[PDB]
Amino acid sequence: KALDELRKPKFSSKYLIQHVSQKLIPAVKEWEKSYQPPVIHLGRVLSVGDGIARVYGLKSVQAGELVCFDSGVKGMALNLQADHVGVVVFGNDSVIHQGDLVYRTGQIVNVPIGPGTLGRVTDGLGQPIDGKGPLTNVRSSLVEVKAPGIIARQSVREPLFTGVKAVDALVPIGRGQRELIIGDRQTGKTAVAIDAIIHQKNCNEQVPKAQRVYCVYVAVGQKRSTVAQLVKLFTQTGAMRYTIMVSATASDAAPLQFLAPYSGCAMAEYFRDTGKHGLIIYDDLSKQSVAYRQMSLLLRRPPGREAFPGDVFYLHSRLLERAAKLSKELGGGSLTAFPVIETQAGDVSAYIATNVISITDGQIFLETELFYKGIRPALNVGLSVSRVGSAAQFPGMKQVAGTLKLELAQYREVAAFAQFGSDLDAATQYVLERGARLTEMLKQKQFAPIPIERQTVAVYAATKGFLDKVRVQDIVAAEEAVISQVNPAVFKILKANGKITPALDAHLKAELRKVKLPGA
Amino acid sequence: ADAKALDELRKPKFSSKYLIQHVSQKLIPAVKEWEKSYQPPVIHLGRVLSVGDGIARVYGLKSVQAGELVCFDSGVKGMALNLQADHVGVVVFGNDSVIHQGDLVYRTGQIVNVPIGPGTLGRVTDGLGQPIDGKGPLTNVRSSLVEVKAPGIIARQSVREPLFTGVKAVDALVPIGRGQRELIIGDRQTGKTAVAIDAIIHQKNCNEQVPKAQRVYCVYVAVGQKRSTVAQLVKLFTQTGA
């Protein structure tokens, strides 16, 4: 039969009725007098749902262009399909109906950056939520920017002092690298980042204006009460004048959580482009990858491993590559990134964890087994790498850091032999007790950053045996006794001269002999 | 809609003729004036509807056999694997970049043939049978199917006669018969090709001592290796005499 070829329809489109109704409703003779909705610069919402709106129209919209619904909520045009535009929603999608108008704004996504952003608890879109008014001394730059090239960078030289003894000796961090703090839940990651912020408050009042570090903390997917406690803490220490709090919490919409580290990186790149130094902590980057996974899976993109999209490596790559040490022709600024990736029961062979480990230079693996051994911070010293190495390590700390690494390397292999109490060797016992001295030396209470000169003196006093006479159980207070009972001149000249000179290593060699240790 | 309300349009039901009478004289010059922007319609031929990643979906081809060597107008051959309701999904033997949306596909009437026989003994062919050693085309050879049926239960006898491999562990522990499917499994860089090439060289050595019926002629199938590894194996077999 000749009718069978036209039996079943072969559609090249889905919203065919939406194209037919733009040509049949003018065929009514009474509806030719401007009875047509324009779709050149406007757009009608076809289907809302789950924080995803699909908009018919928007012919002149750009990919990644921030559009605005007529309800007031904004949105980012992400999928530019052949017959509609898949628009994510930056807020609650309860305010959107089918048939609402979408007014595009012509702007790729913008956040207020500048010197007036300091101390402002803002979202991943730019609105402050701390209740201190709008942003005043700011300017509106792009969210997604191109990373600096190969000309625009120089070598990572100057160190970024953390204040934590387990990381400033073993895993040193220079001003301009990307150092990952990877661990499990409740292992000390956010606390290490907060100590890295509070040490900048302790440091910035001793250095000039060109050497100050302005922190930016990006809380993605956390609670609102956690960011409230952190704002209370940074105000109680007074470090809010150096800190920007970008906060897209768990109540906030999924594209806000997706764009929070990008917004924070744009707010922290202002100090990098103006010769200052910046420090950004993309806290809970795995929750940002989860928010991007949800935003893509509702946008009908084909999923891959662990139902993530393909370009989720690119998602963290183009975010982390904006952290660099610029050359002197471009201002000499720096941005030191600190991603935080949570693993689940130690599976480091996951997808997002391997991607962020493959991107970043260093890694700080905090383990939940050594957290409950009393070793706080729970730094696994074997797996932690720092690929600047001794190029940006503090001099003086470099004189003892090789000894610390080698002695802890022997103490890591002396294990599985200490469970036989009569099996004395008198040489593996010496390194076995020396490793306990060095391990319990590197403990710190939280929210207590130690300056780098006192760290160098305190680890010098332990790698040279000046706390070797005490027991293994009293080194947490003998450390404080060694810090207090020495002359204040030793730290005062060690911070200034830059290294342990031969004109100092005979002074504090004897100043450790006039100390009182609580054990003999 | 259903089929019951769709079959009943096969009978004429207009009860007026003010459209089908006039435009039936207008339609033929209307399709004459756009004769240039057409393509000649394919019924028993094949037109490429789309192409991607080495897979071309060919509209048309009303009489291909499932598995027939189709040949594009670019000179590259194909193989009609899946036959859909409206189009043919063929594969592309080689460069897919020389196939655009709109090419012509001619079927050859050949389930995929390879040149077999005595003349291909000593030749390096590709996966379609065409020689790549480059000493002329194949002589004293004939085409046969690549997907012949395996012989049945009556057509086999018991594996008795032994295939000496020349390897001591193979001939001492895991002895190979002369009709035996035997897997050489392992990890990467463990010597699986080593046992393979040792077996081939030993069948060369034994073929010059057995009288003319126990002569076993090896065949090597290199899938997915380097061109330099196959060239190294060719130089090795030629310097041995295999």
């Binding site: 000749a2 009718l3 070829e5 036209l6 039996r7 079943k8 329809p9 072969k10 559609f11 090249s12 489109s13 889905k14 065919l16 009725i17 194209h19 037919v20 109704s21 733009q22 040509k23 049949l24 409703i25 003018p26 065929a27 009514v28 003779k29 009474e30 509806w31 009875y35 | 809609a1 019951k4 309300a5 769709l6 349009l9 096969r10 004429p12 039901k13 207009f14 009860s15 007026s16 003729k17 003010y18 459209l19 089908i20 006039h22 435009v23 039936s24 207008k26 339609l27 033929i28 209307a30 399709v31 756009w34 922007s37 057409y38 393509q39 319609p41 037109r47 509807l49 509209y59 709109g102």
Partner: protein
Amino acid sequence: LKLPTAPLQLSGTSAQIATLLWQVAAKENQLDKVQDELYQFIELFKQHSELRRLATDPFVPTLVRTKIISSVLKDSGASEITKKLFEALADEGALSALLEVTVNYEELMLAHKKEVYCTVITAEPLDKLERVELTKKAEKFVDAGFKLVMQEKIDKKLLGGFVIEFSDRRVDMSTAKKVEEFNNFVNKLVLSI
């Protein structure tokens, strides 16, 4: 802006075009003109091959298809509704959806023309007192004030009676099923009693 409501709701993406077509042609009160035009286009697709080549071939460019459907439908007193419909359906290659947009349009118009079909299938040709007594018993199955038509078919398998085919419900008042339900009712008691 102000479209008259369709009498019965329907399915998506081919019935929606028929819903919009009935709404627009009911705003213009050309509801039986465009049905005749769609019937004419169904038979016009049946007649020639150069028109069904505009709907089954995937290598025709959309420019020549749009210009052919405009330059053909320029004349012959065609409605504005059917002209703009075929322009919009030829711009997107949806000419093959004509055969199942017109069926949903016919279902819509049959809902409006307030006329429901039926089919009575019988064994003998019906006489005029059989027919006027058939209409009173078959009208009790419709549910409002309608115009239920009565079609006739003859099939020898029934031993008298009638079976009504409403295309959605079936009333088997035949004797061939009466004796078929009779012989089933006896054998459920002989196995028991």
